[PDB]
Structure formats: C-alpha cells, structure tokens
Design a protein around this ligand. Sequence first.
Ligand code: V55
Ligand code: V55
Ligand code: CO
Ligand code: CO
Ligand code: CO
Ligand code: CO
Ligand code: MG
Ligand code: MG
Ligand code: MG
Ligand code: MG
Lengths: 479, 479
Amino acid sequence: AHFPDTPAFTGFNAPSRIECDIPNLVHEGTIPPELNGAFFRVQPDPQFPPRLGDDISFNGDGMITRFHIHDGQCDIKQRWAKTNKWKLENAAGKALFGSYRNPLTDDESVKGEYRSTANTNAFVFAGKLWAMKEDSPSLTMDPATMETFGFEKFGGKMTGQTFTAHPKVDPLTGNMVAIGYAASGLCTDDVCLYEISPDGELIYEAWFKVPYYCMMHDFGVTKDYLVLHIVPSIGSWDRLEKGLPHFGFDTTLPVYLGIIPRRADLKQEDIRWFKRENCFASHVMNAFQEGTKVHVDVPEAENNMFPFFPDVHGAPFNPQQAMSRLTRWTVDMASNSDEFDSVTRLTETAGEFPRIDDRMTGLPYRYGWMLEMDMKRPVELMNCLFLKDHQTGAEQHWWCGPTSSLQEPAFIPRSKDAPEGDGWIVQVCNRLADHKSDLLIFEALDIEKGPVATVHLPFALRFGLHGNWANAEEIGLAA
Amino acid sequence: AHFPDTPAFTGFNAPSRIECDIPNLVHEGTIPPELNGAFFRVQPDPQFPPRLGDDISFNGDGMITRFHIHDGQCDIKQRWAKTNKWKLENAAGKALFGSYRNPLTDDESVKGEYRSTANTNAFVFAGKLWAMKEDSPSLTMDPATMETFGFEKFGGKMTGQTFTAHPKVDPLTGNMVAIGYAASGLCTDDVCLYEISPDGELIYEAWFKVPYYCMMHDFGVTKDYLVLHIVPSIGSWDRLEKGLPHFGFDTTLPVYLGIIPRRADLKQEDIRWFKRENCFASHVMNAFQEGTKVHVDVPEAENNMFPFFPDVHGAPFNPQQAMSRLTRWTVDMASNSDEFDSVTRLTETAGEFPRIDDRMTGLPYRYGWMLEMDMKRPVELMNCLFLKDHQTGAEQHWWCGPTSSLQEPAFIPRSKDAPEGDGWIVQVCNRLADHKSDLLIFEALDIEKGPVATVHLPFALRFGLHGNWANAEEIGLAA
Ligand SMILES: COc1cc(C=O)ccc1O
Ligand SMILES: COc1cc(C=O)ccc1O
Ligand SMILES: [Co+2]
Ligand SMILES: [Co+2]
Ligand SMILES: [Co+2]
Ligand SMILES: [Co+2]
Ligand SMILES: [Mg+2]
Ligand SMILES: [Mg+2]
Ligand SMILES: [Mg+2]
Ligand SMILES: [Mg+2]
C-alpha cells in the first residue's frame, strides 16, 4: 500500500493493520490470579490509503484488540471490525468512502451506505461486542471469536439513523442507555434516546430536538434523566460543500446542558435546557442526582480541543486554552432561570479520558480515574494515570516516564458486590522509544507504586479511543 | 510468560511469537508486477521460557514467515511450525525439552521424541513447505494455509533418524538431494545420503561413515557427488554429561572434504577424503565439477564462528579469527595424495549466508550473493548485501545504513529459462532504530542503487536463518 507522507500516517501514526493471535505474552510482575475475562479496546487503523491523499486520525477503520487475562497470563487477539465500509472496500481493493463525515466525497457506488468505521468504542453488552461509531448504528461482533455480525438495528424497532459510541449501563436495571444524534439525516437537529434490555432488545426509542446540531459525542445518565451537553463543535452541509472539515468550533455560541426525562413518552416540552457561556467539553466522567439537582462531571476546557475541527472564524489553534480540567456542572430542575446552579473545578490536574467504576453510573460516587497531562515532567503527551477521591479530595498520580505515553484506563471490579473502586485498572502504555506497547495492570486505589504487572506486546498499538473490561462469563470465555 | 533476563531473550532477541495476517503491507517504491509467488523464511522464537532459565538462539522454536508478492503488493502470513515438540509443550503449557541437542536435560515424559524445532530453513519442494532442523526428519507444512502436516519419513523408506536443513535441488533431475548426520543416534558417525523425486518420493538412501562426528550442517552437490566438509565443531555424550554445550570447536583436528558418489549402491570404499589444516567453514555457496576436479566455494574462517559452541581447550572466543571470506576448495579425484589441489580466496570481502541462482546448483556459475560485514561503515553487524561476479571478478555492495542490519538474501528467477542471475533478490532488513523490519526487493545484478521496493512490516522479525522463493503455482497460490 502507498500511504501518504503526512502526519496522520507516519511515525506513531504509521498504519498497522495487524490481525494476530499471541497467547501468553511476555510479562513482568504478577498478574492477579483473580482476573478472568478480557479488556477490549479499539484503534482507528486505515485498511486503505485515503481517497483524497490525506485524512485525520478519527477517520481510520476500527481495529479491535482483546486482552484475555486468565490463569496469571495475558493473551492478545486482534481483528478488524468488519463494517459495511470495511467489507465493500476490501472487496474493491481500494478506498470508496472519502473524508470524515462527508458523504459528498464518497464514490457514487457507495452512496447511501453506512459510513461507519466502528472505531470509537469496543463495548460489551448482552453477550455481544459492540464496535461503535456515532454516525451509524453500532456494529456488533462475537466477543469470543471476534467475528463480525453486522449492524444492530434491533429488529427494525430502531428508526433513528445513528447510535452513540458512549453507551452507559444503568446499574439499577442493567439497561444500556444510548443516544443517536443527527437521527434523521446528516446535520439534523433530531436526537434519539434509546434504552436496551440486558437481553439486547430495544425497549424504547424517544425523539427530541436540540438547540443546534453539533457533535453530541458523549452524555450522562442518571436514574431519571439523560444529561446532554450541547457544545458548539458544529457542522453543516455548507461546510462540506466548501471542502472544510465537517466540524468546526464556534466560540460565539452558548453552551447548553439539557436534562431529558428517561421516558418512552418523552415530549419536547418535558426538556429543560440550561445555558452557560461558551466553553468546550467532550467526555463525561459520571452524572448523578441530588434532590432536585443534577450534577455532571466533565473535563472542561476554555476553548476547542480538536485542532482538526478548527475555529470557524479562522483563529489559529490555541493549545493552552485546550487544556481540560475535571469540572462539576450543577443544574437545579426547580430553578426559575436557565442559568446553571454552579460550575466548580474539581481538580487543577489537566486530563481527559475520564472513567469510573461503572457500577456507579448515575449515582453519587467517590472515585474517578483520568489520563493526565503533567507538563512539568521531563519528555526525552498524556503521561500520567490520575485518580481523584471526591470524598477526601486526595489525588494520586503515576508517571509513565520520559519516553512513553498512556491510553485510556478501564476499571475491573473485584466482584459484583465489592465496594466501589475495589479492583484493578488496566491501560495501554505507548513505549515510544521501543516502538512497542505494554498493557499495565494497577491496583485501582494504589497507583503511585506503579503497575503490579506489565504485559509486553511485541509490536506497537496505535492511538486508541475507548475500551472496557468484561468478565469471562459475559463474553463466552472459559470459567 | 516469565522469560529470562539474558541476552538470548532481550532487546533484538525479545521473544515475539506473533502469528498474524496482514495483506497489502505499507510499502515504498515499485514492486515488480512480474512477481507472483512467496518468500518463506524462518526465525527461532521460543514458545515457552527455557527449562534451564537460559538458552541459545539456535534453540528457539521455528516460526515461519511468508511474504506473498502478487499484483504489485506484498502480504504477510506468519505461523508456527508445529513440531511434535511444539505440540507437546503447547498441550502442557510449559517447556518439556531442555538444552540444545541435549536429551539428558529433557523431561522424562518426552524421552525418545523428536526434539526438532524446525527452525533452520523454510524450503519449498514437491508442493510442500519444509520446516527443517538437522536433528530429526524434516517437518512439512501446507505452503498455502501454513498448517502443519507432520514429520516426513517417506513412507518408512527413510531409516536414518535425521534430515538436513540445507537441501539442494539438482537442476538436471529436479531431485532434492539431502543428508542426515548422526543417522543412527546422537553423536554417531553414520550419515545418510538421500535423493527425493520431484513428486516427493524417496528414491534412495545410502549409508556411510565420516572421519569423526561433528556438525555436518551444510554440504555441496554436483552431478556425480555429495561434497561434504568435515569441520571440527564436535560433540559427544561426554560433553553433555558434563553440562557443556553440545558442540565445541577443536583447533587441533584436521579438516576433511569428502567426495561421496551420488549412488544408491554407495559403499564406504568408494569415498575419497581429502585432508587439510584446521579451519572453519559452515555454509556452501555452490559446488561443481571440472574434469576430474571438484570445486566448492565456502565462507572460510581461520577459527570457530560459534561463540556459544566454545573452544574445547578453554580458549576465549576470537572474533577476528571468526571473520569468514568466500574461498574455493579444489580437490582432484585423480590425485595421488589426500592433499587439496588448491585453496583460493575469492574475495577479501567478509561475509556469510552465501546464495546463488539455485538453477546453477552443482554447475559452473557466475554469480554469488552474500551478507557482508563491512567493519569500516559507521554504526550509530551484517550491514551490506554483496554480489560477486566470478567471470569478471567485479563486486557490488549495498549498505543498509548505520542503524540497520540484514538477513539472508534469496534469489528469484525472472523465468524458468532466463539467464543466470536474471531476476531479483529479496531479503529482510532489521530496522533496529525503529524496532521493525522491512522486506527489500533488489534487481539482482544491480544492487548498488539500492532496493527498487521497500515493504514495511509494522513489527520486528527476529534473527532469521534460511529462506526461499517459490512461484505461486508451486505453492497453491493464485495464478
Ligand atoms: C474516533 O472518532 C471520533 C472521536 C471523537 C472524540 O474523541 C469524536 C468523534 C469521532 O468520530
Ligand atoms: C538455527 O539452528 C542451527 C544453525 C546452525 C548454523 O547456522 C547450526 C545448527 C543449528 O541448530
Ligand atoms: Co415495549
Ligand atoms: Co469518546
Ligand atoms: Co526405487
Ligand atoms: Co545454515
Ligand atoms: Mg435482536
Ligand atoms: Mg471564553
Ligand atoms: Mg509420501
Ligand atoms: Mg590456524
């Protein structure tokens, strides 16, 4: 393959496209014998050179990595998420779909097809592996064989066009809670709220509209509510016609937080929109209710965090204003005005990729993990694992050293009934000087002493998005 | 896996154990559209940590790499050679066989089993892939699927215990010509000569004895003769009982060159042994006849080339005396004495891994390729590809640069009837600074301008031994 000599395809961003199997990877330390399950994660990884001769990182085909941990050892299985895009281009031996979220650049032979790369999350639910991309229904796969099933449209009961890559699981019911924005077509202001039973059946789909079309990448879920931030990374057909990146950031637009009842009978009039001054937030650590208030914790930045989705008025990217810090947004459903109740920074540590013990989804919670960027460390990057204790305020930091960087952590509970945070953190470490990757295993509430096990991969993973642990019994692997 | 922190298992020698598939590898330059076939090579690569807690490179399990070149692109498929050793240890989840060529260190549960790692050659013949190790019958595999068949004992017609890893193909008949030393048991002085028909049937096996048991790793073949150098890298049960490496080098023993008729009715009395002063040679570029003389070209060194098979009188390893140079050994079957007719250095370039256009096996020939060690180059190693022209004396050199090293080249003929050397060279390049490997493609008689195509692998291969090209129609791949 002749790939472009551009930053998105060279160095750490060289295409990999490895499908492989390796049991019993070389490792150091002690892998807890308690661990019996697998960590799934996804990397964008282009099957083919881009039609245009350049592209962005968020547009690579989804490649799924599975780390099966059992019997004190770690195995790897890596396979493509075989989206319709993947299959069609594989059959043709060439790229057919074009630029990011831009159907005007597709070959005529794939007009109307799902454009999903399934490259944003590798999520386990209802016995399936979900390879997810927010512009289409989710792909599903067999978590044991990692063969691909296809797109999940829930027996035709789903009528929206799209499905999130940030599903939540409500610990009260076991339901998956999801959204799908641009639900009636590209750049539309329609959004669907979905709930899926533990057995994988669509319970309900509820339609509503948002103040403006924008990237609705993540969201919060509480017992009663969908908690949906409206942040002006906006797109339009006009932008696509002019050859601009689909999304650009508009610093002049307000930010909203919508509180949307989790009800099949939802009507537009039931929704409250709170309004604040322009800022940027993408991910949600957790949301929860307190009396008539709703709290949601997000990494907040002063300005755009996506340089490839540039300022719509032509401003150059500002890295300092892109530094995000975990911040609590609080709104009161009983308040008279549309103002937030408060906006409270929770740490001065800069970071992203927030995570919790997902058994606390929608509930008051004590622990949050993040990828931290400590700019005071030597670099010879997201260079630390960070743990915040909301009860005491205490913070822990683990630095990966001066030639490495880190990927998103994922929490592994010790048992169904264990206390919050009782378990382990796993995360990929980019050993940049060695052009390889490690999988790190930490004791989840004692990270400053470093990982208790380091699993070496004999090759490099690419930049990853989201990932999740599932116990073996949930994914068809051995007891 | 917990592997030792010793040189044989760290750095460039870290275990890899990657089984993978990647079509359409990232590449630069132009892959000749004429190419339609595959290059097979083997790396020792330990499935399990060694029982003793250390080991040598030559004892790693064989991992087979296939580079399928077609339609201007290059694909990789990599799979284990599933020897009985591999299967038994895989079933047990642990190492069962011990030190190199030392059955005294094996677990009692595998006494008497073939100890082969199939780690020295990946050879194509009679529609099969041969994964070869000189202490056992060859393993065979499907060259298209790279599944393993098992050990080849030719329907019981082979009674020797062992089969070489340096088979030759006689261009006159298409027969595979092979030896097997220690043919009646470890450290015995019996050797078998084998010829195999193009259809894979054993034609004959002929037994003889050698002046002393030693590592008979390679050999030459001419129309009339097996050409067998006797070089005193010797082994013994006594050495094994004392915990020494199987082989050690004895500088006080003579070197012999045996000329053995290629005849099923061979008797010991038919053999001529020529004798010379102590030296070291392992590999054979080619051998051929001229009148009543026999010529064989070998990389000759003054002393031992294997530091892990040390001097038997305790001398420290001497790297300068290990530097080998292509040298022609000439004997005359009509000579009265046992002296060589001549010993003639053919180049002052130091090198190993000699190769030819294998259509010239056993014939007078013009071209020879080698891996060269140019110690005058900056190193920031086997660092050059070398081509010798025996007709004009001319030499070509291509340097891989100051952070790389090279593996064995292999010649690809343009067509069955093309002139000698008309075709391409392929070889793996170790990009040590990048911790990855490339496959290089050269125009075989024009190497100084560098490769015409560079195929990037997104991971590192380990040190390799021998490899071979086969056209697609010989290995069940597409026309
Ligand atoms: C990996 O692809 C995407 C990632 C994100 C946020 O991290 C937003 C949109 C994408 O398409
Ligand atoms: C890769 O294993 C071997 C290699 C050699 C010579 O290169 C001799 C004996 C072996 O077992
Ligand atoms: Co219903
Ligand atoms: Co995300
Ligand atoms: Co016969
Ligand atoms: Co050899
Ligand atoms: Mg269904
Ligand atoms: Mg501002
Ligand atoms: Mg047979
Ligand atoms: Mg001498």
